[PDB]
Design a protein around this ligand. Structure first.
Ligand SMILES: [Zn+2]
Ligand SMILES: [Zn+2]
Ligand SMILES: [Zn+2]
Lengths: 590, 132
């Protein structure tokens, strides 16, 4: 269990204690880190403590060898030397410790709180290995934070599926959704056993909550639910593989006379084949899904696997491939939990397929020939290197868009994060530009593209279809009630319920609510197709209903609204409460 | 039509006579034990979705051997196919078959159970514990 250092990458086997991830450190490097930082614990083939039981000194600043063990000054034997090296820390291997000085950045990485944008932007500016370490330690910080969440001390249960929820006092009570995982523990002075993997979502109305779990008892009074965290695995592969140019094709099987929409893109495809990899910088709605389908149509011969960040995007991609590509050569890998529904029409996790699909957190450790991944704003730098390690192919394809919202990054609560700094790929794609760019959207008609180009985008965007004349708006405020986290604007729901009937082809209009409580209560009231922004995006729908509850940085986000409106096909109607934002667009007011 | 009968009758003889009516699901009155939140009990019920095809023998004499074929959703199709694939060794499981027919322009799933008995055990038990 020995390796190289991190700052100097010299052969060493010492690790710091206070640093949570405990990485390999050299003599001089670790010495400088403990001199600067308050880390006063070093791990080795044995711990560093005052061996004398009458002392409990763990500081590396003073610890004196008792011949074979470490001692303090009040316990140091005469014939013995302190093990604080000559401007270093005594340890294993000293004669081959190559020098490196850039420790202050690493010192700050292990010091900052990941609450200020400076932490995140600087973490995207360090060395590759430093970047991997920063990503892993941020992931661990997030896991530790979510572990220290509310313990739901309940008292009542309503039904075989409905229960009554209540929490303790002091720790953050997490919200309720299928993404979370909980488990009750029976406290009978013994048998504190797991009652099943429970996921929770709020009930319909009042103090009523729906409970669902892997097993299902009728829960008692004294139990509680704690959010557990999942471990973080170290990684080795680089986040980005190096680029190499070529002259001729890299061994791909083309299809002569296959289609027409992608013949104009064959030059782009061969440009991709000219390099080890290629990326995609284009605005959303440009049919980049169908563009990827046609790119596959160019060389649909090798045995390939694909993936996407979320489920809705990969399900839409599966449908698009089914529509274009032959069915019995593509598959979608599903997870064991599967608490979120998926494309329940294809092969159920058939890994032995020619064009496979999956999710980020369910990817296998196999290999392929080419690959594409959906969205870089949704992804960090950790998963990039993770898929770099588990999957190794000859060509890689990446897609993304600057105008999409980034990953949640809940710990970052101050300031705004620049789109180029969402990940390493974002900085690269904003620094060197696109590999190929497509700025025409087939989903939305002319009025929507004009509004998006005028308001948030650059005045460059265009479309192919004329206005559908289905533009409407409303402004009145409505009141909220401070529900779970945020609240719901119920009078708007009542007004929509009363009014909708006049709109004939809008019964299937996709209701939009980023807030889970409103997203559920809207379906509870009438049953419109419910949807949230994150579960949206990348796709497009004929009939959409947007609902803004109140005004706040979350709801007033320009990016949220613009990525929400890029999902209109033939008709849409949105409610809102902001004045200047209401004046901003160029549609019918009504 | 009759191609549906031909597909259902896969390999084992061909002595079928539809007790139902082509693609119509013949309805019967059979006993059941069921417990699911909304209801709970052990009583008689009306079975609906069962295309019963009694297999006869040589000289066209009828015998107790029924090919029940049922249609359901699509998720259930894969789920039951997987679980049966797990357990397809024990001699205690009735031989199954899975396919999708085209009654119309629809990919409707089908599940086939071969060489069954006219009455289950629940009917026999219920006939003795509720005698009249
Ligand atoms: Zn440290
Ligand atoms: Zn070092
Ligand atoms: Zn001591």
């Amino acid at each position: 269990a020995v390796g190289a250092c991190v700052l100097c990458n010299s052969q060493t086997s010492l690790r710091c204690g206070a640093c949570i991830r405990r990485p390999f450190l050299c003599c001089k490097c670790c010495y400088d880190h403990v001199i600067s930082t308050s880390h006063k614990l070093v791990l080795s083939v044995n711990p560093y403590v005052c061996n004398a039981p009458g002392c409990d000194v763990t500081d590396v600043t003073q610890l004196y060898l008792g011949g074979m063990s470490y001692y303090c000054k009040s316990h140091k034997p005469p014939i013995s030397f302190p093990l604080c090296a000559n401007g270093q820390v005594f340890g294993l291997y000293k004669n081959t410790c190559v020098g490196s000085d850039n420790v202050t950045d690493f010192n700050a990485i292990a010091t900052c709180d990941w609450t200020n944008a400076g932490d995140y932007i600087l973490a995207n500016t360090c060395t590759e290995r430093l970047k991997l370490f920063a990503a892993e330690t941020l992931k661990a910080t997030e896991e530790t934070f979510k572990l220290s969440y509310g313990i739901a001390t309940v008292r009542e249960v309503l039904s075989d599926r409905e229960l009554h929820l209540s929490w303790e006092v002091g720790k953050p009570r997490p919200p309720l959704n299928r993404n979370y995982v909980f488990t009750g523990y029976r406290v009978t002075k013994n048998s504190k056993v797991q009652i099943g993997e429970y996921t929770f979502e709020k009930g319909d109305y009042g103090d009523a909550v729906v409970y669902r779990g892997t097993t299902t008892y009728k829960l008692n009074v004294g139990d509680y639910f704690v959010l557990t965290s999942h471990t973080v695995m170290p990684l080795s592969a680089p986040t980005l593989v190096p680029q190499e140019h070529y002259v001729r094709i890299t061994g791909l099987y083309p299809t002569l006379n296959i289609s027409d929409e992608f013949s104009s893109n064959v030059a782009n495809y061969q440009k991709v084949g000219m390099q080890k990899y290629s990326t995609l910088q284009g605005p959303p709605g440009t049919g980049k899904s169908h563009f990827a389908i046609g790119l596959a149509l160019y060389y649909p011969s090798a045995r390939i696997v694909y993936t996407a960040c979320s489920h809705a995007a990969v399900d839409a991609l599966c449908e698009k491939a089914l529509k274009y590509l032959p069915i019995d050569k593509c598959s979608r890998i599903i997870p064991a939990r599967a608490r979120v529904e998926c494309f329940d029409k294809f092969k159920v996790n058939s890994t032995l397929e020619q064009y496979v699909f999956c999710t980020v957190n369910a990817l296998p450790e196999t290999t392929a020939d080419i690959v594409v991944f959906d969205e870089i704003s949704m992804a960090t730098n950790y998963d990039l290197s993770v898929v770099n390690a588990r999957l190794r192919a000859k060509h890689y394809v990446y897609i993304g868009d600057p105008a999409q919202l980034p990953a949640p990054r809940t710990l970052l609560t101050k300031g705004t994060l620049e789109p180029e700094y969402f990940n390493s790929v974002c900085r690269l794609m904003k620094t060197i530009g696109p590999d190929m760019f497509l700025g025409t959207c087939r989903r939305c008609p002319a009025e929507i593209v004009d509004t998006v180009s005028a308001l948030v985008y650059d005045n460059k965007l265009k479309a192919h279809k004329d206005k559908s004349a289905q533009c409407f708006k409303m402004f009145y405020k409505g009141v909220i009630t401070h529900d779970v986290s945020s609240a719901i604007n119920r009078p708007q729901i009542g007004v929509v319920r009363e009014f909708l009937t006049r709109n004939p082809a809008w019964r299937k209009a996709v209701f939009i609510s980023p807030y889970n409580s409103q997203n559920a209560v809207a379906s509870k009231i009438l049953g419109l197709p419910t949807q949230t922004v994150d579960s949206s995006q990348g796709s497009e729908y004929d009939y959409v209903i947007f609902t803004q509850t109140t005004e706040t940085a979350h709801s007033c986000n320009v990016n949220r609204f613009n990525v929400a409106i890029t999902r209109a096909k033939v008709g849409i109607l949105c409610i809102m409460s902001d004045r200047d934002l209401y004046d901003k667009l160029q549609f019918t007011s009504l | 039509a009759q191609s549906f009968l031909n597909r259902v009758c896969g390999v084992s003889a061909a002595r079928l006579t539809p007790c139902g009516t082509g693609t119509s699901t013949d309805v019967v009155y059979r006993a059941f034990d069921i417990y699911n939140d909304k209801v709970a009990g052990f009583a008689k019920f009306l079975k609906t979705n069962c295309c019963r095809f009694q297999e006869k023998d040589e000289d066209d004499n009828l015998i107790d051997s029924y090919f029940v074929v049922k249609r359901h959703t699509f998720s259930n199709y894969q789920h039951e196919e997987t679980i049966y694939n797990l357990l397809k060794d024990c001699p205690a499981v009735a031989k199954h078959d899975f396919f999708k027919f085209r009654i119309d322009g629809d990919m409707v799933p089908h599940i086939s159970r071969q060489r069954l008995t006219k009455y289950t055990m629940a009917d026999l038990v219920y006939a003795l514990r509720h005698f009249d």
